[PDB]
């Protein structure tokens, strides 16, 4: 079987993308943030502390005939930006773009941090990294992808995120009409539990490609592109009004400028991010200063190929026994 769902940016800046998910019987549609940097499927629900719920849509396990409480199981997760959530777990039918999985673990939030309450458009997250990062205790639960692998026509899922436009998430098949040229695959290390790979180098604008190993993770749940401080400094050195701003927290530049492109290597292939994808947007509505899409990963402790990077390509998350990552220009 296969599944195909449209994913849309939550705002005009492409801060995150939401994809509709059907949970329970009859189906309860929630808009989730598909995250390749985490492994938990959690949602706001009838159990979440009332005062911590904004206008998000909640899952009511009591209204679903197929919901089953997973006795004794609890969960607690903290993300890179400091947000967190926790609760109990239920198993229920979950469908994404026509692909249905039964007995999928749906983690019910009892409490959520301030940033989640504040984001009215995100109803929860759907983890797509390796099941080893799942926070359910005492026994970890499999991700939606791991549970679907048996029925998938092919153990794969593709990410085709749009630039200021909708995109698509497909499960079990590769849409040959969605990209140009051929897909180049690169090995993945599951040691840290992420979709971890090593880039072959980079190039700024129309300059020279520098062969240097860049170990990073493909994470659809992170907005920006975080690279080593020296590579980021080399990029910004090509933008005359750009500077590192301690108050804003990163490189900023005149919205006025035409940014050079940024190329990253995948084995022998090259993925080019258009300079405009690097212009995230004004620091404030009406400001003449814009926030850069490429920032230093020095403080994160790890390089992350976020949305700004991923949206410039067609990405294939190949989940076979020995997983691999494929990238194609589009
Ligand atoms: C089991 C623990 C796992 C290893 C946790 N995994 C992670 O924290 C990585 P993630 O991709 O799952 C996680 C998902 C988010 C929805 C919280 N992303 C993050 O934690 C990163 C912050 C970060 C990561 N690393 C260093 N800093 N968040 C982000 O990148 C958020 C995403 C977002 C935007 C808008 C609305 C909702 C969500 N965007 C963001 O911060 O954008 C600006 C930099 C412009 C402010």
Swiss-Prot record:
GO MF term list: aspartic-type endopeptidase activity
Documented EC number(s): 3.4.23.22
GO BP term, pick one: proteolysis
Residues annotated as the enzyme's active site: 35, 199
Catalytic activity, reaction form: Hydrolysis of proteins with specificity similar to that of pepsin A, prefers hydrophobic residues at P1 and P1', but does not cleave 14-Ala-|-Leu-15 in the B chain of insulin or Z-Glu-Tyr. Clots milk
UniProt superkingdom: Eukaryota
Disulfide bonds: 255-290
Keyword annotations from UniProtKB, A to Z: Aspartyl protease, Disulfide bond, Hydrolase, Protease, Signal, Zymogen
Segments forming domain Peptidase A1: 17-328
EC category name: hydrolase
Family per similarity comment: Belongs to the peptidase A1 family.
Name listed for the protein in its UniProt record: Endothiapepsin
Organism annotation: Cryphonectria parasitica
Shown stretch of the complete protein: 90 to 419 of 419
């Amino acid at each position: 079987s296969t599944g195909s769902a449209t994913t849309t940016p939550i705002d005009s800046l492409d801060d995150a993308y939401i994809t509709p998910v059907q949970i329970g019987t009859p189906a309860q549609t929630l808009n989730l943030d598909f995250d390749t940097g985490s492994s938990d499927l959690w949602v706001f629900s009838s159990e979440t502390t009332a005062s911590e719920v904004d206008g998000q849509t909640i899952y009511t396990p009591s209204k679903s005939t197929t919901a089953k409480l997973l006795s004794g199981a609890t969960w607690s997760i903290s993300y890179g930006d400091g947000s967190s959530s926790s609760g109990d777990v239920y198993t229920d039918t979950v469908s994404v773009g026509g692909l249905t999985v039964t007995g999928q673990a749906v983690e019910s939030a009892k409490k959520v941090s301030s940033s989640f309450t504040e984001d009215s458009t995100i109803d929860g997250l759907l983890g797509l990294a390796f099941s080893t990062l799942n926070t359910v205790s005492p026994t970890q639960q499999k991700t939606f992808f791991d549970n679907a692998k048996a029925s998938l026509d092919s153990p794969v899922f593709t990410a085709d995120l749009g630039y200021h436009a909708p995109g698509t998430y497909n499960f079990g098949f590769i849409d040959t009409t969605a990209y140009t040229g051929s897909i180049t695959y690169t090995a993945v290390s599951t040691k840290q539990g992420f979709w971890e790979w090593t880039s072959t180098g980079y190039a700024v604008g129309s300059g020279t490609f520098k062969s240097t190993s860049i170990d990073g993770i493909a994470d659809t749940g992170t907005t920006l592109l975080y690279l080593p401080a020296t590579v980021v400094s080399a990029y910004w050195a090509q933008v005359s009004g750009a500077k590192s701003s301690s108050s804003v927290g990163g490189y900023v530049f005149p919205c006025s400028a035409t940014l050079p492109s940024f190329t990253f290597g995948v084995g022998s292939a090259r993925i080019v991010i258009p300079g405009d994808y690097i212009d995230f947007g004004p620091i404030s509505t009406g400001s003449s200063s814009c926030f850069g899409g490429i920032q230093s990963s020095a403080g994160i402790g790890i390089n992350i190929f976020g949305d700004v990077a991923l949206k410039a390509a067609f990405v294939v998350f190949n989940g076979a026994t020995t997983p691999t990552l494929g990238f194609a220009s589009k």
